[PDB]
Amino acid sequence: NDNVAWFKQAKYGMMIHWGLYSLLAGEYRGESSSAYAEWIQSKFQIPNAEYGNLATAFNPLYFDAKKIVALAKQCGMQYLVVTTKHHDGFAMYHSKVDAYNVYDATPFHRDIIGELAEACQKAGLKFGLYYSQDLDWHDPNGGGYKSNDVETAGTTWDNSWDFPDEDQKNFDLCFDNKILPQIKEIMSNYGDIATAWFAVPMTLSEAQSQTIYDTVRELQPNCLINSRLGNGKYDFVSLGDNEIPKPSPLGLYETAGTINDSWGFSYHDQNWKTPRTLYRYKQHLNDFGINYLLNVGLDPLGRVPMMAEENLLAAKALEDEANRL
Amino acid sequence: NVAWFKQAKYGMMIHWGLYSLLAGEYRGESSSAYAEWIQSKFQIPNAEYGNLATAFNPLYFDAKKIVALAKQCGMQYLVVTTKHHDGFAMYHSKVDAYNVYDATPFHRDIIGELAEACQKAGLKFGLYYSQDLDWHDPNGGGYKSNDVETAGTTWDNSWDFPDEDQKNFDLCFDNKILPQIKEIMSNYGDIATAWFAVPMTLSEAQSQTIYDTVRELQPNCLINSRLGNGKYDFVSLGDNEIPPSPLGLYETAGTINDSWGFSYHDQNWKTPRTLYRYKQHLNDFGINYLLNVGLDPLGRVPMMAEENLLAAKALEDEANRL
Amino acid sequence: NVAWFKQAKYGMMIHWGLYSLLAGEYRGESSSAYAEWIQSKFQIPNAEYGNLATAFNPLYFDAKKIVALAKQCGMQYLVVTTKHHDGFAMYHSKVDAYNVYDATPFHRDIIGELAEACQKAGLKFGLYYSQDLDWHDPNGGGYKSNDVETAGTTWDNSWDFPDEDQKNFDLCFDNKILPQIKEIMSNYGDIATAWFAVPMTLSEAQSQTIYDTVRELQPNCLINSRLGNGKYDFVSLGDNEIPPSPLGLYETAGTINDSWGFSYHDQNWKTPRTLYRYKQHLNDFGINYLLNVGLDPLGRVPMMAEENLLAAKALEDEANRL
Amino acid sequence: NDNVAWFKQAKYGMMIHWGLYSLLAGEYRGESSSAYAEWIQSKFQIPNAEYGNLATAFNPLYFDAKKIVALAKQCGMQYLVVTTKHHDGFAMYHSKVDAYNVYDATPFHRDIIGELAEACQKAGLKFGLYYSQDLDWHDPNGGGYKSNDVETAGTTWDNSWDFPDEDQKNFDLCFDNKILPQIKEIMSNYGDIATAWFAVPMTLSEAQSQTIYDTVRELQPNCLINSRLGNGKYDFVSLGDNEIPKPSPLGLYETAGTINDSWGFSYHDQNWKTPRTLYRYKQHLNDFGINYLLNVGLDPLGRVPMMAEENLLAAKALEDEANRL
Ligand SMILES: CC(=O)N[C@@H]1[C@@H](O)[C@H](O)[C@@H](CO[C@@H]2O[C@@H](C)[C@@H](O)[C@@H](O)[C@@H]2O)O[C@H]1O
Ligand SMILES: CC(=O)N[C@@H]1[C@@H](O)[C@H](O)[C@@H](CO[C@@H]2O[C@@H](C)[C@@H](O)[C@@H](O)[C@@H]2O)O[C@H]1O
Ligand SMILES: CC(=O)N[C@@H]1[C@@H](O)[C@H](O)[C@@H](CO[C@@H]2O[C@@H](C)[C@@H](O)[C@@H](O)[C@@H]2O)O[C@H]1O
Ligand SMILES: CC(=O)N[C@@H]1[C@@H](O)[C@H](O)[C@@H](CO[C@@H]2O[C@@H](C)[C@@H](O)[C@@H](O)[C@@H]2O)O[C@H]1O
């Protein structure tokens, strides 16, 4: 596991958020999502029957793994993270365990995680996966239902509309049958997984948390794990905005951000960070040994938004200018 | 129909086609201000552009809700792109399989649903048709008028069909335009208004011909000053043409933002106050206002389009009680 | 005054000071979301920032027109920055020459003109005052609470006066705050509402003291829950505090865009529909809505602020006849 | 006059629009100017009495000639053009002949053209002047009054509100007493004038046009003149949008543009051309030997707008990256 040497010096990665939310793109029956377009289902409490129907329209003719990695590489990014399955519970890979996925439910009929994994392999880009182990709005017993006190980017953390029998919910039925099986799948196919990115535990017991830790280590021996899974059970610390100038034993650090203000594609969110904002931030994080993980929200046709692409390239140009200074 | 049109005051225009899905973006680059021209701007081969049809699945398209919205804003008629410059028919065309019904997963007659929804809602129903430009046909129009600049590149499909001189527009007219014009003027019930583009190549003969087809099939259908000089019922006026028309019928078209087709990046929405003031001014001059919405790939009125249109109606009402 | 405040529903807040002229820009760089903090964000020396006073000449400032506008929107009271964190008084302060009247070409009492304009217009008149932060005074407040982050840098003027421990807030309170509070509570006629900032350093003693000054001078003046616990009349609620107050009087403050001070670059204006819906929701919960405008260097309501506020009023009226 | 060799290779210049219009910044009594904020007086037919009053507020503490030229030079611009006097008739220099000027009428009490001229001299930047020889809204007999047929960025071309006796107007009274005297002043002080930039003649007779030509040649022997003055009477052709791929005998070409859509500062016009748009356009023009003259509309405090500055620098960075390719 030389992953430690490479990660301390990697400096820069691309993150991709993509799913059904990208097609609504922050808009519903004349109204805006919150800041988080990928949260749109919770914001408006969209029934699974309706929300799920987007799968029939998901036909991104312009999705192109080859082209995306070329762009990333040109900007000097050394690794790539992708949404394998977000809060909405729609798998972006061909899951044996669950047919609610890009491959089975959509005209596209293709493995999003796969095509990117290969392209990355060939380009010499490391390949990471993101997975939402706790919230899952598709599963009757999804997590979140005891932590509804805290405010969210939607309404409740859990699917409180389709499944309102709050007391009769049991996350375990969800954990054993979907989360752990799906985690097993993604950690086994698509080759070497360099980085593992989990969502924020609210409900997953330490037992359940420990299980995932163990599962990943045996399946992907060299895979570095983000501090989010569970206390004691990680390799690099994910830093949040206010953690920017808990303990990291390998000396490995990452902060994730987006270029505009949303993680998922949002038509109306044109508040793109300037090239200079992008470059300066990277410089500051890197000098503090913190890696910068920069998100692209793919558009409905599978394209990097024009303004996202432009701004990334200018920050790279600025960087080169400045580093020959 | 004449009395009704003189008092109508307000109409909806709809741009819709394959171009709406690219939404102003092509291989990392921006369309012009006019997003619906996107195929020409970048000279997208017919094979590829047409392929968009395989992705055209607007689950949230809803003629009823759209017309309900239109009516709520006080609009008395609605015009729709039956077929724009791209040569893609948005109705179930017998003569050409390059159409919404046969070529797309959606597999539905957009014009039909709107025609019925309008009939049932008691809204008049108009049609737009590109009788001159046709980027899908080897002998499509446009190739004699290329000195003047466009919102794309050439007027014609000069890329797939570059044999400029061996092109002959007559072959296209005989086989696609007039048949398609015949199609739309017979189905979809009463057609109150007919909207044609600006001839470049269509001879006076051809211009007169289309007129006749409409008169025989749709006697009271009012025709826009674009067909031919002497051979029309209302004059289309542009912004800069307003400070003959034999019936005294007048219309000016605009868009809410700066594009006709949906364009992700064009958020330069005119404020509600701008929209309302213009209509009042036009109406006071008896000019009818036809205001265009370019619906997005899911068939939705863009949020800012809907909000601002509705706010303009509220603004109008306050002032007429004032 | 209590009965009137319970039914008022709608107020204007005004941010104004030297910061408005920089308008979100300093030596090529952006302020935070909160433009009025600009001096702290970049640690602009008092000598330089104060120098803005020499440029403060708002020829188009017009209290009458502003109040006319406010009244037209149905607002029943108006609050103004008498002196914000920057420590610049926007009224003719006897105690400190760092003020609009003496230090600026404009040479006018902004609060006075507004107080009169409001009296004459029949609008109630409120005051905002930064009783705690004061970036102009060597011993200004803020220096005991620097672990928590701000919209600038430090809470206090930690740059001109970096001798953190040899600072003593009491000296500032005695010489500037309470005298200035005394000033504003005696002149400018009837004061209906009083708006203080969040204590960091102001002891309970000092908090109680200001209260007394207001009660003696302005018996019916209603006081915002910021002064001190038990020692107040209405509770200021923030967005996230709403899904004690002994009189049942409540107010929530917001801005139209994302900044309090004028900021050239902050064009993220909330649409009219957003503004109207929020007010209705608050009012239904009896919470009064106080909506802030940061006037620009010429004393003007920004075009998009005026347009959207007025459109929101029209929107409100339509719905209550519906 | 080696100006020919230098200009064919100069490639890039800064233009500055600045005057009273910058303080209204595209806004009047709750309403927007047209696209051209510097036209604001005509758009709303603002009486001279009111419009002129802005002079008392013109106190740009942050005007800084030194800093502006440094920025320009860093972007590789080889010359600088400035508004000496725009359509509004407000002189931005200390005019002996007319007290309606930055020096006499404003607290600033400073010569805008002068301070920039010196800074440019010291930096090794060439120094050009723009002057509106035809429209002058301050003069009772200003030009424009026979050409009111054509649509403008305001209303009429002339001051049609304060001075409506259209038939009793005589441009000559204006030409002899203000235009030619003021042109004499600006072409004599402030040292060598490398470039001369005139507005669009509508009304200035050939006689009057010839006069200006002659006046400049004797006063500034080596000064290159923009094709706008008069047919036969120029050194470089000013190209407009539609003249971009009449006759230029020296082979000298310039196109002027702005970064956003306005020439004068406009608070509300945030439609800044992207860095990439700026760079690509320059490249295209330069390859066709056409010089690119790029406008900055100084803000009320005399500062280059933040987004204007940022975008210029990124285009330069992109250019450097690409030219080492
Ligand atoms: C109140 C609120 O919205 N708080 C948000 C959380 O809702 C949000 O989950 C969290 C981080 O966002 C999570 O991680 C990113 C990477 C993306 O996957 C989101 O969809 C996740 O929800 O940020 C808080 O501020
Ligand atoms: C530069 C440019 O292309 N300018 C365009 C013209 O090309 C265009 O013909 C004209 C009219 O627009 C026509 O009608 C609208 C409704 C839409 O269908 C366009 O695609 C048509 O070309 O508008 C000018 O601005
Ligand atoms: C990160 C940050 O600074 N957040 C700010 C706080 O600093 C601020 O205290 C709080 C309340 O804002 C206060 O009142 C408004 C009206 C204005 O005068 C501000 O300058 C004050 O500080 O708001 C948080 O968002
Ligand atoms: C109809 C219209 O607005 N036409 C405008 C003219 O009004 C305008 O004068 C012209 C060029 O603008 C002139 O030159 C620039 C450099 C600047 O000084 C402007 O203030 C001048 O008016 O462009 C036409 O399109």
Numbering used by the authors:
A (entry chain A), D (entry chain A): 2 to 246, 266 to 345
B (entry chain C), C (entry chain C): 4 to 246, 267 to 345
Paper text:
Lactobacillus casei produces a GH29A α-fucosidase, AlfC, that is ~104-fold more active on α(1-6)-fucosyl linkages compared to other linkages.
With fucose in the active site, GlcNAc sits in an aromatic subsite adjacent to the active site, formed by residues Y37, W40, and W158. N-linkages of this disaccharide (as seen on EndoS-treated IgG) can be readily accommodated, as C1 of GlcNAc (which connects to Asn297 of IgG) points away from the surface of the enzyme. When the Fucα(1,6)GlcNAc crystal structure is superimposed over the closed state conformation from the molecular dynamics simulation, it is apparent that the closed state still accommodates the glycan well, with D200 and D242 flanking the reactive C1 of fucose.
